[PDB]
Structures are given as C-alpha cells and as structure tokens.
Amino acid sequence: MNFPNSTNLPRNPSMADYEARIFTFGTWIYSVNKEQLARAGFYALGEGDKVKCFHCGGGLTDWKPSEDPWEQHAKWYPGCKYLLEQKGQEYINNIHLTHSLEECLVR
Numbered sequence: 001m002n003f004p005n006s007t008n009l010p011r012n013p014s015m016a017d018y019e020a021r022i023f024t025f026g027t028w029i030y031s032v033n034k035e036q037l038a039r040a041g042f043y044a045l046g047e048g049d050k051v052k053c054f055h056c057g058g059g060l061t062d063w064k065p066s067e068d069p070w071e072q073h074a075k076w077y078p079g080c081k082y083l084l085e086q087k088g089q090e091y092i093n094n095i096h097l098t099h100s101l102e103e104c105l106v107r
C-alpha cells in the first residue's frame with residue numbers, strides 16, 4: 001500500500017499522455033465517463049472501475065454517477081502535483097472545505 005507521490009515528477013510517466021491513459025479503459029461500462037477520468041490524470045487497471053493517477057499513483061474505485069473525477073482526486077490525493085498544476089490550490093481548498101461541510105450536515 002504505497003505512500004502517495006507528492007513530488008513534481010510523475011510516478012508513472014508511461015501514462016503521462018491523455019491518449020495513453022484513454023487506451024487503458026477499452027469499452028467502459030461504468031457510470032463515470034473515461035474521457036473525464038483521463039483528463040483528471042486517471043487510467044484504468046482493467047479490474048472493475050479501479051483507476052490510478054499517473055502522477056501521484058493514487059487509486060480510486062466504485063464510481064457513483066454523482067462522483068466527479070477531479071473532486072475525488074482532490075479529496076483522497078490532496079498532495080498530487082498534477083492536481084495542483086491543473087486545478088490550483090483554491091479549487092483544492094473549496095473541494096476540501098466542501099467535503100468536510102458535507103459531513104457536518106449529516107452529523
């Protein structure tokens with residue numbers, strides 16, 4: 001169970017190109033869109049809807065149709081430098097503030 005990569009160098013440079021990542025999915029039956037996953041740095045493992053970020057190495061699965069690739073990326077892998085490059089710390093903080101406040105409301 002690897003620590004998340006927080007450096008500015010990708011863990012998996014073979015998956016650094018959008019198109020390389022897009023090829024990993026094949027026919028995608030799952031509720032979240034493969035282009036939206038690939039744009040958020042994710043590629044498919046081939047095992048259910050398990051994906052990994054090319055840069056941080058961070059893995060996620062069990063995608064509900066309401067879960068957004070970028071939000072989940074920020075929620076679980078907040079140290080990812082690819083996420084910071086693409087989205088900015090301000091998007092990151094919003095998302096973080098939001099998912100903590102989602103929790104309050106429920107209790």
Ligand SMILES: C[C@@H]1CN(CC(=O)N2CC(C)(C)c3ncc(Cc4ccc(F)cc4)cc32)[C@@H](CN2Cc3ccccc3C2=O)CN1
Nearest residue numbers: 045049050051052058059060061062063064067068072076
């Ligand atoms: C999209 C959204 C993500 N959720 C969290 C999730 O997917 N995380 C959070 C955590 C980082 C702790 C985690 N650690 C291991 C795995 C497994 C994995 C192994 C390699 C790989 F390449 C890809 C995935 C997943 C995972 C979903 C809810 N889930 C699903 C689950 C499965 C296992 C453990 C915990 C959880 C969990 O919180 C809801 N959907």
Ligand code: NA
Nearest residue numbers: 025026027046
């Ligand atoms: Na596949």
Ligand SMILES: [Zn+2]
Nearest residue numbers: 053055056080
């Ligand atoms: Zn990442």
